[PDB]
Amino acid sequence: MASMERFLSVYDEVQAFLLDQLQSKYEIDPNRARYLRIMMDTTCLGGKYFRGMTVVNVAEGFLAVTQHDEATKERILHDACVGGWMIEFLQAHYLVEDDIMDGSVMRRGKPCWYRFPGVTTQCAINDGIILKSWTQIMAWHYFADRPFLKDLLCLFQKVDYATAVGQMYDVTSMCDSNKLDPEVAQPMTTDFAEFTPAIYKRIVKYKTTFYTYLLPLVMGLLVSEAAASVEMNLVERVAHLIGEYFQVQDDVMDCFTPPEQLGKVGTDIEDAKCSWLAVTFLGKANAAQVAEFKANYGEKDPAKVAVVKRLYSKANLQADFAAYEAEVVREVESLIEQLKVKSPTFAESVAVVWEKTHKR
Amino acid sequence: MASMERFLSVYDEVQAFLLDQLQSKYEIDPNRARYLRIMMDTTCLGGKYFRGMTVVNVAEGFLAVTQHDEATKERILHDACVGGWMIEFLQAHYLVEDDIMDGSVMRRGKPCWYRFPGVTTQCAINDGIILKSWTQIMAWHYFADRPFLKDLLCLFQKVDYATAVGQMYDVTSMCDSNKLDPEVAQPMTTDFAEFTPAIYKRIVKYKTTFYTYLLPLVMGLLVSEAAASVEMNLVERVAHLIGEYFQVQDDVMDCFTPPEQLGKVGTDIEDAKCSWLAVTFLGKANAAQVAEFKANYGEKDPAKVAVVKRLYSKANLQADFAAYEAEVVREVESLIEQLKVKSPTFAESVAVVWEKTHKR
């Protein structure tokens, strides 16, 4: 059975389990069950399933080199699919809530969930809470007797937390740290002194890399009972590196990819985000350019946004990106090589992860 | 050491642990650490700590009748305080998010968190996410080697889920079930056919009773290694009963307690909530009264809200409340008696829980 079909069948299984349990144990009625079914499909389906499928990929890698009964192979694959879905549902939680937080309009060419006419923010916040609770219901049901249950919950827990910490880092990235105060409305930074590579890296490391690359990799090891075949510090390092790279790409696209292609109208400039473009622009700009940046950034006014886009174009940031790219290639290759010492197989899964990110 | 002082010291300990771990492991800076410290205090402190203190109370009950080394008594009490804080932080999560969801103004005589000038909804949603992640960080750290860790996480998990399901039941309670559809903006019910005792009970059972009464009781049993001294079905029944009663009281107060006393301006009528007053009014009203209710309920207009308040006054709902109260007294006493069969001590903790609710 091909990986994607297995993964998608498990979605149907898991959905049916969750909705059946709401009827038998939580006194739900059919109309609310239908609402939740539609919520799950709309928020969890329709992406590329990169994260969930990485869990499946890692597990398949181990199966190819490990002796097992056929029933055991199927069990490990079912586990990897459920675990993949846990990550996809955790992402869905964060997308729902983030879209609300940011007042976002679209996501993947469709309205944000909260904007659906029969949803509203009042329900959507709670819907996003339910998305994440479903991750736990899945784990407790499908993995109840599994030897990796503890380590899987503890890891999941840490990644979730890191993610929420990263969201805080993100939404506060255009404030001056020394001015943060719940009592005082937060001015946008005037100096941009905190738009540095190191500050940027911290945002991205927590907000994206733990759930997008670390969790899928390590969950595939856990459901494979293979975490002792890897040096965990190398897994962390490679995950944080590829994940950073993934975000820089996302930041570039926000500014330069046509809205129809992107699935949304990017607003990083208007939102004054600490993006890779802004940090790298401020890293090479002259005094006059920095001044023109400060006068136009973080403003909804389209004339000012176009001034910022023009400043990025004239600044030839494509060249800084090529250079960053080349350095990421060196380091990712270095880590992959290091991972071969203890597990060729896992090194190869990381290679696959890298190819799917590198050239996308 | 008195229970409240122990409980409050543990708060300081747990806060310090969480903020220290954010500095040493999550790369946090001092200003964001301060923001989170202020968030925790503002959202978790200042209530009566009924829920957290119930865990401590149950545990103290067992200590009085069980042989242990002094160090063990202290360990069990420390555990009960951490576990109490887990519940208080879970409530804080839900209050933060619910206040946002409902567009609430005040809570306990202070502005809702999201309304603080340097917070905003964009941060507050995430803050509420962090509140709940902190429950898990506490459990994994303080209870890592504990024999009850599994059962405690699994229970916690189920209660959290039940709560989010109850929130869905609540926010959808003024819609016609058969009209729920994410594609279509939801009209308020015109018939009120779903304002029944049984539908009401389901809302309250999930939205409040699991986290307010069941979880504190059962967490006190778990940290005491005493869950085999009780019949769990009796614990559930008594928890659901007292919790229902607690909510009916809350519903009455929303309408009739002066705003300064309540800590907020109650808006159940304007929000068209399925309250105990509305269900009991519709249960005794004549045709003309029902018609006047339908014309005025669920409308911000103060003239219409005063018409609804007047209809409740003329309907002498105090008498239905006395009658309900008397029946709750019978049943709670019956369950307490039943609980004495296997544990006098735990029966007595439930009595204390009841006295603190009954006459408050």
Ligand SMILES: Cn1[nH]c(=O)cc1Nc1ccccc1
């Ligand atoms: C363009 N420049 N050259 C490198 O080698 C790295 C960067 N910028 C960067 C800063 C923070 C995170 C990721 C990339």
Ligand SMILES: Cn1[nH]c(=O)cc1Nc1ccccc1
């Ligand atoms: C201005 N130009 N037009 C596009 O479509 C993309 C870019 N520049 C770019 C910046 C950083 C990395 C890669 C490309």
Ligand SMILES: Cn1[nH]c(=O)cc1Nc1ccccc1
């Ligand atoms: C007033 N009436 N008499 C009872 O004995 C109970 C109710 N009403 C009620 C309905 C749903 C939940 C809780 C109370």
Ligand SMILES: Cn1[nH]c(=O)cc1Nc1ccccc1
């Ligand atoms: C109208 N009246 N004035 C108050 O202050 C309270 C009530 N009535 C009431 C309704 C149900 C239960 C208890 C009291």
Ligand SMILES: [Zn+2]
């Ligand atoms: Zn965001």
Ligand SMILES: [Zn+2]
């Ligand atoms: Zn982006």
Ligand SMILES: [Zn+2]
């Ligand atoms: Zn609410």
Ligand SMILES: [Zn+2]
């Ligand atoms: Zn209320």
